[PDB]
Amino acid sequence: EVKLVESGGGLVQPGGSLRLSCATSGFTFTDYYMSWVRQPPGKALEWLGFIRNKAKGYTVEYSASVKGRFTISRDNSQSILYLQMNTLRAEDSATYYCARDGYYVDAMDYWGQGTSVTVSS
Amino acid sequence: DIVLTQSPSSLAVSAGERVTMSCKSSQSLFKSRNQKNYLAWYQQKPGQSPKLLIYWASTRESGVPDRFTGSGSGTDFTLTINGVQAEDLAVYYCKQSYNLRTFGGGTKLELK
Ligand SMILES: O=C(O)[C@@]1(O)C[C@H](O)[C@@H](O)[C@@H]([C@H](O)CO)O1
Ligand SMILES: [Mg+2]
Ligand SMILES: [Mg+2]
């Protein structure tokens, strides 16, 4: 059973930081990219970035909307994915999903449940 | 900055009928290298996490019912649901993976 579990969600004050976690199992972690996607309430899914697989040296990319602000890293020893979000804004208030990705299907084929982040004064 | 525009924004059908919806890409998502179209469809049932439906434009993902068909190429893509089931109620996103990833705005499917 492939499983992805997001955590770290909660209340953050405007300007602040939050580190999200994504614990995985059921597949060879290092063979895949991992992406972070978010979705503010009522709005579209927005791809934030990904970290590549072993074959690609675990390099990273980011959407222009969070490039600089957001950071993605992965822990291959424990098969956990992370997202460091900085300078939080109200427009960052959203559900945050981690998703298995890669150039096998060039898509996100497994998704976590998500964790919600609320940026409140 | 590849922009995917989805149409309609929203639609409503009764169970059993056929629906079609459009994904329009700013740039060709067709890859010469492997002759693949770098577009995928996702289904997000309300209050649930997204689910991959189709990749490489037309390839159904494992476990996905045959009533979903992806078709198209280049900059013009489509998702057809032949025989909508109640389970299909969701927003459907197309996503380019030609260069990084970009989701369309979503097509919301209601059933009554
Ligand atoms: O170059 C690409 O079209 C592609 O999107 C294919 C894969 O999804 C993946 O290799 C990706 C690269 O890893 C760049 O992030 O490039
Ligand atoms: Mg497979
Ligand atoms: Mg049924």
Range of the domain at B61: 1-112
For residue B8, say if its preceding peptide bond is cis, omega within 30 degrees of 0: yes
| Contact (Cβ atoms closer than 8 angstroms) between residue A30 and residue A53 | yes
Measured between alpha carbons, how far is B72 from B75 in angstroms, rounded to an integer? Answer: 8
Give me the total of CB pairs closer than 8 Å, taking one residue from chain A and one from chain B: 64
Query: Which resolution in angstroms does this entry have?
Result: 2.0
Measured between alpha carbons, how far is B102 from B83 in angstroms, rounded to an integer? Answer: 28
Sign of CA dihedral B82, B88, B92, B95: negative
Number of H helices, E strands in chain A: 0, 11
Interface residues of B toward A, Cβ cutoff 8 Å, are: 1, 36, 38, 40, 42, 44, 49-52, 55-56, 59, 61, 93, 95, 97, 100-106
Structural domains of chain A, with CATH: 1-121 (2.60.40.10)
Asked if A27 has any chain B CB less than 8 Å from its own CB, the reply is no
Continuous segment of H or E residues that includes residue B95: strand B90-96
At a CB cut-off of 8 Å and minimum separation 6, what does B62 contact?
Answer: none
- How many domains does the structure of chain B reveal? 1
Measured between alpha carbons, how far is B29 from A101 in angstroms, rounded to an integer? Answer: 18
Q: Token pair 């424990």 is at which residue? A: A78
> What DSSP letter does each residue of B25-93 carry, written as one string?
ESS--EETTTTEE-EEEEEE-TTS--EEEEETTTEEPTT--TTEEEEEETTEEEEEEES--GGG-EEEE
At a CB cut-off of 8 Å and minimum separation 6, what does A42 contact?
Answer: none
Angle at B58 between CA B52 and CA B63, to 5 degrees: 45
3-state secondary structure of A43: coil
Q: Spell out a b/e string for B61-88, using b for 16 or more CB atoms within 10 Å of the CB, else e.
A: beebeeebbbebeebebbbebeebeeeb
